[PDB]
Design an enzyme around this catalytic site. Structure first.
Site, PDB file in Angstrom:
ATOM      1  N   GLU A  37     -85.584  70.870   0.437  1.00 30.14           N
ATOM      2  CA  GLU A  37     -84.802  69.910   1.763  1.00 30.14           C
ATOM      3  C   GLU A  37     -84.617  70.723   3.165  1.00 30.14           C
ATOM      4  OE1 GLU A  37     -83.058  66.474   0.065  1.00 30.14           O
ATOM      5  OE2 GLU A  37     -82.652  66.109   1.977  1.00 30.14           O
ATOM      6  N   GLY A  91     -83.648  62.697   5.822  1.00 30.43           N
ATOM      7  CA  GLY A  91     -84.273  62.966   4.224  1.00 30.43           C
ATOM      8  C   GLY A  91     -84.043  61.750   3.643  1.00 30.43           C
ATOM      9  N   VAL A 137     -92.508  74.454 -12.312  1.00 31.10           N
ATOM     10  CA  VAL A 137     -93.474  74.899 -12.933  1.00 31.10           C
ATOM     11  C   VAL A 137     -93.524  76.832 -12.713  1.00 31.10           C
ATOM     12  CG1 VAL A 137     -95.328  73.548 -11.881  1.00 31.10           C
ATOM     13  CG2 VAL A 137     -94.523  75.805 -10.459  1.00 31.10           C
ATOM     14  N   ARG A 138     -92.212  77.604 -12.099  1.00 31.90           N
ATOM     15  CA  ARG A 138     -92.474  79.061 -13.293  1.00 31.90           C
ATOM     16  C   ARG A 138     -90.809  79.442 -12.338  1.00 31.90           C
ATOM     17  NH1 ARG A 138     -94.577  82.907 -14.802  1.00 31.90           N
ATOM     18  NH2 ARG A 138     -96.885  82.342 -14.808  1.00 31.90           N
ATOM     19  N   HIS A 165     -97.931  64.542   6.345  1.00 31.25           N
ATOM     20  CA  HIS A 165     -97.981  63.261   7.463  1.00 31.25           C
ATOM     21  C   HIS A 165     -97.441  62.652   8.169  1.00 31.25           C
ATOM     22  CE1 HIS A 165     -98.698  58.991   8.622  1.00 31.25           C
ATOM     23  NE2 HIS A 165     -99.908  59.499   8.578  1.00 31.25           N
ATOM     24  N   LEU A 166     -97.543  63.654   9.608  1.00 31.01           N
ATOM     25  CA  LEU A 166     -96.865  63.378  10.584  1.00 31.01           C
ATOM     26  C   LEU A 166     -96.681  62.207  11.452  1.00 31.01           C
ATOM     27  CD1 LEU A 166     -96.917  66.744  11.822  1.00 31.01           C
ATOM     28  CD2 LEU A 166     -95.223  65.358  10.564  1.00 31.01           C
ATOM     29  N   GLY A 167     -96.162  61.220  10.442  1.00 32.10           N
ATOM     30  CA  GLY A 167     -95.825  58.845  11.228  1.00 32.10           C
ATOM     31  C   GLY A 167     -94.863  59.864  12.631  1.00 32.10           C
ATOM     32  N   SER A 168     -95.376  58.524  13.410  1.00 33.30           N
ATOM     33  CA  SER A 168     -93.931  58.029  14.416  1.00 33.30           C
ATOM     34  C   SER A 168     -92.617  58.250  13.757  1.00 33.30           C
ATOM     35  CB  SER A 168     -95.210  56.725  14.875  1.00 33.30           C
ATOM     36  OG  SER A 168     -95.165  55.885  14.453  1.00 33.30           O
ATOM     37  N   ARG A 169     -92.972  57.096  12.340  1.00 32.83           N
ATOM     38  CA  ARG A 169     -91.836  56.302  11.803  1.00 32.83           C
ATOM     39  C   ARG A 169     -91.589  57.118  10.592  1.00 32.83           C
ATOM     40  NH1 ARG A 169     -95.747  51.116  11.205  1.00 32.83           N
ATOM     41  NH2 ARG A 169     -93.876  49.587  13.203  1.00 32.83           N
TER      42      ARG A 169
END
Lengths: 138, 138, 138, 146
Positions: B64, B83, B91-92, B107-111
């Site tokens: 984060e 966020g 997993v380990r 994904h790099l959206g506009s919103r």
């Protein structure tokens, strides 16, 4: 309803955090119902992001910390639990005071568990909702 | 293939954690490719759980923290990212050295944005894989 | 990278869906690599939401369908897998043709497994990213 | 309290699904409360996995289907909601009858919402617990000076 399999006191719990992350964050439990486990945490230069707001990861640290022990308290003997998957929705920010996490079980199976931890601020305003899926290892 | 809309330096970037959780934990960004952002974290008393291993919440705090900044560097002007949801799968385990989290966009959206943060141990073995969904605010 | 502990052909694999949701949604396996399993699904009246776009739930059925069998193929004997948790981010919509799901492992332990399934549109663009956690049952 | 901003009948709610996935799996909305929405789904050949049990994917189809509309009902005008991410825990299997989804809001923000959907079997036993996060998309005509 009593889900707990082991017996413990706030005294022993809070003792666990000394020497590791839980400690350096001042996470102290403050209740142990028949099927519920609570805890709180501050909001400062340790649990804040570069803008002075309760860090989202801090809430997850808090959620996992409580869910882990709670899952443990639901096992017997040499049994143990290991967190497998965790998720959280940050629905409201926090800038001061302490947040209280309330952990309840969603499912307590023989091989795995699912815990829900709702985090509220001093005013009682929901700031984060998370789930923890753990596996019981013999 | 170059996603950043805000130019930044590792020096100025690392400066971010100068009084907040990201600092107290010793998270240091070490790379800034055309589409990736890396940053390592110390697996010590500060980030370990009651059993000496890396705390799952520490893994998420790292995720984060790297995702929040990656998202921000992909906005412009007075925009900001908040966020919304974060999920991680442990997993380990890891007990020593530094864990590295490699953040790339799904994904790099506009919103909204979706970031994938894979955390590896010094041996380059996946220890935690997580996704962070952000909201872009004006 | 041969992860499969079992042997199976696309023919036998696809015959599993006849008479159940998999066959009803026309989900079809098309590739079995050393460490990946691929399958397509139509974006039609049986998989669209009210507005003509791919229903997010359909993407998840594709994901769990590929991940479940993949998990099976990674066990042996009377062992079988059970899905514990699944999550996903819808980052792009699909409105026609068929989408393709690509599943690869993130963890294969003796007790559980974690699978990542990415779903792409006919143009090779990511439409959904998901994770599935299973438990192995002796 | 009343969270809904639009007023819809069950009839109109169920008509939305004809011709698409919801209609094909016989998902039926059966109850709209002040702050809850419920829908049912059969556990049959259309929703079972190869082993004769309820397909976890179907459960997620039910959840997203209910959560999606609940989210829409909480928006006014030409506004709309888009599903961002979903997660679910399969805590118990089902092999016959129907399962019931009960959707409650966890957050009804101005820009995004979080929905919680719990799917129960005939006996009221939890089979799947899911969360859906949606984004609200603005809509409608805007005034302009003239």
């Amino acid at each position: 309803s009593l889900i707990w399999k082991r017996k413990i006191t706030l005294e022993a719990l809070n003792a666990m955090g000394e020497g590791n992350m839980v400690g350096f964050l001042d996470i102290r439990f403050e209740h142990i119902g028949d099927d519920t486990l609570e805890a709180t945490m501050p909001v400062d230069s340790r649990t804040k992001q570069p803008f002075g707001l309760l860090h989202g990861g801090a809430s997850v640290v808090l959620a996992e910390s409580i869910g882990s022990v709670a899952g443990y308290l639901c096992t017997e003997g040499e049994q143990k639990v290991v967190g497998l998957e965790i998720n959280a929705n940050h629905v409201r920010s926090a800038r001061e005071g302490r947040v209280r996490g309330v952990c309840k079980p969603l499912h307590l199976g023989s091989r795995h568990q699912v815990w829900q931890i709702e985090i509220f601020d001093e005013k009682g305003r929901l700031c984060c909702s998370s789930r923890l899926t753990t596996a019981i290892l013999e």
